[PDB]
């Protein structure tokens, strides 16, 4: 069951990192 | 640099075993012990790392 929690948390960090792409829009502004 | 990467990227696979408290509760155990271990064991299993907070600061 811990593996299920591992995968879920694993994808969270990915989405949180890809959010850095939003920071790029800040520069354009 | 390579050590830190290998250190952080080391994979952990040990087949975390499942605990059947009912089996131990039945065969033999100290009254209140098998239950006290289960309730206390389960409490810590709920706790988990907060990957979100770290993802933002980095």
């Amino acid at each position: 069951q811990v593996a299920q929690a591992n995968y879920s948390k694993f994808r969270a960090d990915y989405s949180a990192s890809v959010a850095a792409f939003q920071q790029r829009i800040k520069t354009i502004e | 640099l390579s050590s830190l990467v290998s250190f952080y990227n080391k994979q952990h696979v040990e087949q975390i075993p499942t605990i059947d408290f009912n089996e131990w509760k039945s065969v033999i155990s100290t009254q209140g012990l098998v239950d006290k271990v289960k309730e206390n064991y389960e409490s810590l299993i709920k706790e988990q790392y907060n990957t979100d907070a770290i993802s933002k600061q980095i």
């Binding site: - | 050590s3 830190l4 250190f7 100290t30 009254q31």
Partner: protein, 53 residues
């Protein structure tokens, strides 16, 4: 009565069990990583290892 008669866990007998749990914790937390010894001399890394806990 057999609950206690059959298994008469004494205070010191259960005490030893509790010490193992505490000993397991201190070993798990205080366990610091073992990287290149003579290369991890940075002020930050050595500071972290001291306060590893």
């Amino acid at each position: 009565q057999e609950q206690a008669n059959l298994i008469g866990l004494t205070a010191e007998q259960l005490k030893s069990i509790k010490e193992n749990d505490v000993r397991a914790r201190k070993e798990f937390l205080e366990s610091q990583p073992k990287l290149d010894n003579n290369l991890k001399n940075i002020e930050s890394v050595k500071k972290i290892l001291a306060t590893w806990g």
